[PDB]
């Protein structure tokens, strides 16, 4: 059997380091490669470093493209453990999609020297997805991680969405626009949210009728949408990074 695997992650979180650790040492930095383990093939794509699933540089749009449309049997989220409260922002955006997800915490060797120990399971409950801590430069933990991934892929990932409620005013707006994306390849909720935030990427697949139905909905949120969404996301991220984080 074959497995499409997308390693998306924050820039300088060790994403290319891990890619070369697993496989081996089209213009843009979309580096693909295959390895095999126990009779099952993998197709690893290195999605360029991004902080958000929205649009920016060009590489941003490039990476955002494959996040939403590529067939991916699993999405490995490469997150640097040293700076968690930033890197969890994109991890927060990825869980909304309901795509098969892992949170691979990297630089655990460097995090360990900081006297920062993390409640990886209290973190795991907040996110509702497997959280795997490792050092990518330690190729013993990479050899073991190959087995960790292959078992996860075969059994499937059990996922619970993240309890982000954005205020009942926004939730009413979301539940009106979810009909449009009910079938879609990712969560209808995330696409309705990203349409309310007015992502040009999302609106492209919307007709004039649907575009101007969403355009209506934006002027219904009498509080600034972009400001509101970040406020709720900070609310969740901060109460997360206080609970799971121990420093000595
Ligand atoms: N101390 C430490 N440094 C790491 C670890 N993993 C990656 N790095 C560093 O992260 C740097 C950049 O990673 P890179 O492969 O460029 O990731 P990308 O920028 O997301 O593609 C490398 O030069 C490594 O030195 C780790 O486990 N421990
Ligand atoms: Mg606006």
Residue numbers in the entry: 1 to 25, 35 to 65, 70 to 261
The authors write:
For this bacterium, Feo is the primary system that transports Fe2+ into the cytosol. FeoA and FeoC are known to be small (ca. 7–10 kDa) cytosolic proteins, while FeoB is a large (ca. 80–100 kDa) polytopic transmembrane protein that contains an N-terminal soluble G-protein-like domain termed NFeoB. The status of GTP and GDP bound to the NFeoB region is hypothesized to control the opening and closing of the FeoB pore and therefore the translocation of Fe2+ into the bacterial cytosol.
Despite extensive fine screening and testing of multiple conditions, we were only able to generate datasets of GDP-bound VcNFeoB(His)6 that diffracted modestly, but completely, to 4.2 Å resolution in the C121 space group consistent with 4 molecules in the asymmetric unit (ASU). Using molecular replacement with our 2.3 Å apo VcNFeoB structure coupled with strongly restrained refinement approaches, we built a model that clearly displayed GDP in the nucleotide-binding pocket of all molecules in the ASU based on omit maps. The crystal structure of VcNFeoB(His)6 bound to GDP reveals multiple amino acids that contribute to nucleotide binding. In the absence of nucleotide, the binding pocket is fairly open, while binding of GDP elicits a contraction surrounding the nucleobase with the associated amino acids responsible for nucleotide recognition coming together. In this structure, the Switch I loop that is important for GTP hydrolysis is mostly disordered, which may be attributed to the flexibility of this region when GDP is bound. As the nucleobase enters the binding pocket, a region of random coil from Asn119 to Asp122 tightens, and both residues (conserved amongst NFeoBs) become within hydrogen-bonding distance (3.5 and 2.8 Å, respectively) of the guanine purine. Underneath the guanine purine is Lys120, also conserved in many NFeoBs, which appears to prop up the hydrolyzed nucleotide in the binding pocket; electrostatic contributions from this residue are not observed in our structure, and in some NFeoBs (like those in S. thermophilus, K. pneumoniae, E. coli and Gallionella capsiferriformans, and Thermotoga maritima) this residue corresponds to a non-polar amino acid, either a Met or an Ala. Interestingly, Asn150 is positioned along a region of random coil (known as the G5 motif) above the guanine purine but turned towards, and tightly hydrogen bonded with Asp122 on the G4 motif (2.3 Å distance). While the general NFeoB G-protein-like fold is conserved in our structures, the GDP-bound WT VcNFeoB(His)6 structure revealed interactions between Asn150 (G5 motif) and Asp122 (G4 motif) that caused Asp122 to decrease the number of interactions it makes with the guanine nucleobase.
